[PDB]
Amino acid sequence: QVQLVESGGGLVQPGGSLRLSCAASGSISEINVMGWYRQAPGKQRELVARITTGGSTNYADSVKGRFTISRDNAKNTVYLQMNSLKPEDTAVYMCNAHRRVVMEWGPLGYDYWGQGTQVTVS
Amino acid sequence: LATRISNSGPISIAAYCLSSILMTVTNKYVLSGFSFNLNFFLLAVQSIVCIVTIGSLKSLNIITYRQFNKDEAKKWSPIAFLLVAMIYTSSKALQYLSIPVYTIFKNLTIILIAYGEVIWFGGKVTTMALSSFLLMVLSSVIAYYGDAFALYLGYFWMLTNCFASAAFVLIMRKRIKLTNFKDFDTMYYNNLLSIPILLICSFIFEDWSSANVSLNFPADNRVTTITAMILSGASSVGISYCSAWCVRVTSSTTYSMVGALNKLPIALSGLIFFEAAVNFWSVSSIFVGFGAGLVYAVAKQKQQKE
């Protein structure tokens, strides 16, 4: 129903920089939260950042003060500016989008996941 | 005064719209950053909140309702099964269909409840009342206009919701009359029996993997998730009482028409308090919906005098 395409990943030298993007598609009116996750090889998903329609940003301590998630309502995109990338930042970064709909007995939530962009820092 | 208000038709209607407005506001404007894709477990938590809410009021000697009965829970089971049936089929309907298309089909069920109340409860559907049903479908059509297998499953899970939603109100309203249930007995049984079904449905039909659990219940934010899981269920106390209240006094048709009119204040709020477009296909949707309510109201006046 909602489709997300990610672009921006790649190989960057330690201490460098990277900007990731995630364009949403489909029904984009019920989406309330959109964030980024990373899966280190051999480990499970972790939270990198989270934004909502209203600009309330949630980060992770390991990346607090470095990564900056922002939104662009013109094209329904979320960016993730990753400065000062240490080698421990290499992972596969995925996008999220929460669809929330409210009816006569309660809300319903549907999570949509992007494709994943591999980011390698070396 | 608790008796005159209890058997009041207009008041049950007004209290139902207020409780629907309050519940939609909490889940859309107060809890905007909330993310929870374990639908049946959160709805089971809502029924737990309403159970402890009225169970504590009765234990404080404020309100009073009937004791739990084994022979009366076995007779309320079809209604509780149907209540979760609408929940399951609508969640599966909205995974392939949108909200605007969901409302088109949900306003097409009032024509089916109106003609089910006639067959089972006796009566007639007037022409003035019928034209108001088609004016709510028109407002839905106007508002909406402003994989092949996937869209086949979209309407399959939507026609099954139409049958489960129509059967729920018709069967429930019948059962508040051979039991002489009040609005707290109906609320008590609708929630007590729905807890085990919603929990069992959440076990088999939902993802309880290590990664989806830690995505729904983050360890770095537990007070926020628990708080939002209780504010989301405390706003449904009013709509749980006022749904059974409205059905008992007025009708299953009137309760369904009021539910369709409960989405017009939300639409008008978006056009004033938010950025929602003011194009012709969104202003004439509200105006046409208002005409549907004002034609249904006069239709029942003529029917009352006929």
Numbering used by the authors:
A (entry chain B): 0 to 121
B (entry chain A): 48 to 193, 203 to 362
Reproduce, without paraphrasing, sentences from the article in which this PDB structure was first reported.
GDP-mannose is a nucleotide sugar metabolite that serves as the substrate for glycosyltransferase enzymes that build the fungal cell wall. Nucleotide sugar transporters operate via a strict antiport mechanism, moving nucleotide sugars into the Golgi in exchange for the free nucleotide monophosphate, which is released back into the cytoplasm. Here, we present the cryo-EM structures of the GDP-mannose transporter, Vrg4, from the pathogenic fungus Candida albicans, in complex with nanobodies, in both the Golgi- and cytoplasm-facing conformations.
We identified four nanobodies that exhibited the ability to block the uptake of 3H GMP into liposomes containing CaVrg4, with two nanobodies, NB3 and NB4, showing full inhibition of transport function. Nevertheless, we determined the structure of Vrg4 in complex with NB3 at 3.0 Å. The CDR3 loop of NB3 forms an extended beta-hairpin which extends 23 Å into the GDP-mannose binding cavity. Specifically, Glu104 in the CDR3 loop forms a hydrogen bond with Tyr311 on TM9, which plays an important role in recognising the ribose group in GDP-mannose and is essential for transport activity in S. cerevisiae Vrg423,24. Sitting next to Glu104 on the CDR3 loop is Trp105, which is located close to the conserved (F/Y)YNN motif on TM7, responsible for guanine recognition within the NST family. Interestingly, Trp105 adopts two rotamer positions, with one rotamer engaging the guanine pocket and the other packing against Ile134 on TM3. Both rotamers would aid in favourable interactions to secure the CDR3 hairpin in place. However, NB3 makes several additional interactions with backbone carbonyl groups in the loop between Tyr76-Phe87; this region of the C.albicans protein shows a high level of sequence diversity across Vrg4 sequences and hence, while the CDR3 hairpin interacts with highly conserved regions of the transporters, it is the CDR1 and CDR2 regions that drive specificity in this nanobody.
